[PDB]
Amino acid sequence: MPHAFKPGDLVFAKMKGYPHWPARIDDIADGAVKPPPNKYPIFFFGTHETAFLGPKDLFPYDKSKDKYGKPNKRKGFNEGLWEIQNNPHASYS
């Protein structure tokens, strides 16, 4: 059975106006801004932007890749696919 989400988990993350997007649950660095309660720090592959989202917007990568892991016109999307598939745990500083 599923656990709760944890840092390092790989997902497709959905925001209003954008396709399901390759992403990871980030850690919070010591001394860094924490998210609101009930929200996770989401790092989006390709764009390298962060947002705070709840589970309703988070689709586990393994289960969803066949639906969602297809090239897309949007800026950074295809880079994002390479990253989630090829080095999803790296520093994208």
Q: Using CB under 6 A as the criterion, which residues of the chain lie in contact with ligand A1A38 when the complex forms?
A: 15, 18, 21, 44, 47, 49, 51
If the CB atoms of residues 15 and 69 are measured against ligand A1A38, the closer one turns out to be 15
CB of 77 to ligand A1A38, least distance (A): 7
Give 5 or 78: the residue with its C-beta nearer to ligand A1A38: 78
Q: Residue 20 and residue 11: Cα distance in Å, rounded?
A: 9
Q: Which residue is nearest to ligand A1A38 (CB)?
A: 47
**Phi, psi angle pair for 2, to nearest 5°:** -55, 145
Task: Using the minimum distance from each CB to ligand A1A38, give the nearer residue, 1 or 80.
Answer: 80
For residue 65, give both structure tokens.
Answer: 């890749």
C-alpha of 22 from chain center: 5
Query: CA-CA distance, 62 to 40, in Å (whole number)?
Result: 19
